[PDB]
Every structure is written in C-alpha cells, then in structure tokens.
Design a protein around this ligand. Structure first.
Ligand SMILES: *[C@@H]1O[C@H](CO)[C@@H](O[C@@H]2O[C@H](CO)[C@@H](O)[C@H](O)[C@H]2NC(C)=O)[C@H](O)[C@H]1NC(C)=O
Length: 361
C-alpha cells in the first residue's frame, strides 16, 4: 500500500516548536513524500521559497537512510491562481515550454516525480488538463530513454462531485497518472453559515442534502467514472476546521458566525494543526458523529471538527476494504511531528496510525 505524505515549505516559518523542516521527517514513515509548492515563472517550473534549493536537498537526503523512499515536487497549490494554470495549459506553446522544463529541474534537485496541484479546473479547462497530463507523461517516457528510472506523475484532485464533473476527464487522465490523490477533506468550511464536519467518511442517515459530501461517495463516484482502484489514493487530513459559534447551540446544525480564532502556532483562522487540537482538547467537550465516523470538540464559543487516531484508522480500513492504492496525508507538518503535544510518546501519531493499519493484511 502507498502512504503519500505532503510537506509544506511555509511550515518552516512557524514560531517555536511549530517550526518544521524536512529534517524532522521519519524516513521510514511514508512511501512517498511530496514537497509542496513549486512555482511557474516564464512558463518554466521554478522554486518558490528563497531557501527551497536547500530544503530540497535536506528532504532528498532522507533517501540516504531509506533508499526505497520516493520524493515528488508538487506544482501549483492554493496560493497559485488557477487562472495561471489555465493560461499555461490553454496554449500549446506555453504548455510545451512548461513540460520541457520539468525533467531537468527534477533531475537537478533529486526528485523522483512531479505532482500536479491545479486547484481546480473549470469547465473551460477540462480539455487542456487532459492535454497537460498526456504530454507531460509522454515527455517523462521519452526522458527515461536516457537510462534513468522514469519520472512519476501524480495529481491531487477534488473530491467534490460538481467540481469533478466540471473540470476533469477522469477516464482519460487516469491512464496517464501513476496515482491520483483524492482531496476527501474539504466537504465544508466557513462557506456555509452553519457547523459541519469537513471530512466525514459516510453520509450519515441524519443529513440528506449533500449526500455527495463524504469520502465514501467520492470514492464510489471516481470508481464509477473509470479511475482504477489501484491508482486511487484517499486523502486523510491531519488538521481540523474551527468555527466561532453564534449561539450556545453545539449539536449538528448549530449557527456559526465565522471561522474559529487562529492557533498559537499556525496562526490561520479556520484551521488548527493536530498538535494544536491536542492542546485544545484539555477542557473541551468531545463528541463523535457515529454516522459519519468522525469527532468534533467544543470549548466556549469555539467548535472544532477534526480527525483522531480512531477516525484515521477507520478511514484506513475503509480504503483497504475498497482495495484502493493507499492513503495520502495532508501535511506531516500539521501532525504532532515533535511528538510532544499529544500525550503518548510518539512522533506523527496520526500518520503512524494510518501506516499501522496499512501494514496489516
Ligand atoms: C511565481 O512566479 C511568478 C511569475 O514570474 C511571479 O510573478 C511575477 O512577479 C513579477 C515581479 O515580482 C511581477 O511584476 C509580476 O506581476 C508577477 N506576475 C505573476 C503572474 O505572478 C511570482 O512572484 C512568483 N512567486 C513567488 C516566487 O513566490
């Protein structure tokens, strides 16, 4: 089974123990580590952070300890306007320029592959996305003639039904991609003026509006659209989503006034790292959607939807039962990587729980 793990370059800037460098990553934890977010300048892949070349080097030296480990560099991301991808992919000449520049860059810095994070193809982009994947893959096949192991090609894809139908030709891109990571953790957010879980496993016979907003539906849908199980990877979040309650109501459907206040370390409204959640739990009330199989917690006027060891193990057993290729974990730097915030004396408690289930039959 694959265990695909993202590392984000901006995590280095967090203060105190929040600061995370590639050097903190256990080489034997994941099968694949993806460094997050390369830029595109002059229609060519390029670094983003001033010290990326150094961090690339730190990450890729984990392979001196685990020669089986593969690394990928992901292009795009949220702070990368999709309009920009759109421009690049729409023109055969801009597209070819971007594609030709990829292999030499990956080779220079020691990556084994490229991950596409076009955070969302519009209706007018579907066709060009297909072209980008096709031609990128053809170029990697050509480059392998030089005698070096063929570069891997992956993509991070929306798990939202409407977004899927709108921007992706799943049957087509699936045959050119080595794996497809499903972003099965964005089924809610401030977005809706009410409380809800962003990463439910099942629909839960309670709510019946966006029956499509759960991991199970997305997986089933992808399989039906033609993505082979053996290339599908289910995304598992290592962060939580917070909300500021508009009332004393805590149960499902409770009114929300906006996102929660930022954590001490991640400093971003609406999100908390798992290590920040562990600190938050002391004094909070914990609940669990038995239907959806995921927990939430509340303290004062703050409501948090998150995943714990149990929910992550549960998701991991599900993916095995469906014979998927593995799991993807969004953000090693958001898990308790120091292993000093969450009781138990364990580094990467969430990611490790996933690996253990996967290690089993
Ligand atoms: C990502 O690359 C783009 C394209 O080179 C950079 O954006 C350009 O910045 C120049 C000079 O800073 C500006 O005048 C342009 O308006 C920018 N254009 C676009 C489309 O972004 C961008 O700075 C890079 N991002 C990094 C390194 O964080």
């Amino acid at each position: 089974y694959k265990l695909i793990c993202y590392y984000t370059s901006w995590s280095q800037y967090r203060e105190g123990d929040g600061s995370c460098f590639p050097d903190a990553i256990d080489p034997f934890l994941c099968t694949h580590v993806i460094y997050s977010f390369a830029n595109i300048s002059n229609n060519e892949i390029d670094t983003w952070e001033w010290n990326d070349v150094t961090l690339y080097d730190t990450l890729n030296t984990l392979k001196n300890r685990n020669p089986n480990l593969k690394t990928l560099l992901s292009v795009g991301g949220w702070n990368f306007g999709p309009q920009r991808f759109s421009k690049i992919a729409s023109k055969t000449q801009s597209r070819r320029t971007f594609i030709k520049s990829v292999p030499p860059f990956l080779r220079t810095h020691g990556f084994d592959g490229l991950d596409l994070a076009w955070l969302y193809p519009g209706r007018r982009d579907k066709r060009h996305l297909t072209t980008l994947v096709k031609e990128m893959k053809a170029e990697f096949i050509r480059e392998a003639q030089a005698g070096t192991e063929q570069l891997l090609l992956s993509a991070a894809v929306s798990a939202g039904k409407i977004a899927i139908d709108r921007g992706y030709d799943i049957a087509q891109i699936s045959r050119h991609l080595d794996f497809i990571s499903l972003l099965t953790y964005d089924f809610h957010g401030a977005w809706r003026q009410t409380v809800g879980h962003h990463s439910p496993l099942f629909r839960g016979q309670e709510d019946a509006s966006s029956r499509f907003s759960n991991a199970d539906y997305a997986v089933s849908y992808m399989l039906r659209l033609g993505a082979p199980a053996n290339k599908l990877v289910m995304g598992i979040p290592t962060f939580g989503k917070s909300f500021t309650l508009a009332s004393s109501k805590t149960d499902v459907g409770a009114p929300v006034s906006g996102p929660g206040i930022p954590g001490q370390f991640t400093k971003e409204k609406g999100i908390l790292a798992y290590y920040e959640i562990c600190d938050f739990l002391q004094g909070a009330t914990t609940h669990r959607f038995r239907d959806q199989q995921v927990p939430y917690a509340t303290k004062g006027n703050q409501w948090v939807a998150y995943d714990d060891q149990e929910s992550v193990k549960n998701k991991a057993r599900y993916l095995k039962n469906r014979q998927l290729a593995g799991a993807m974990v969004w953000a090693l730097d958001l898990d308790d990587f120091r292993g000093t915030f969450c009781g138990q004396n364990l580094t990467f408690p969430l990611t490790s729980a996933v690996k253990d289930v996967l290690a089993r039959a």
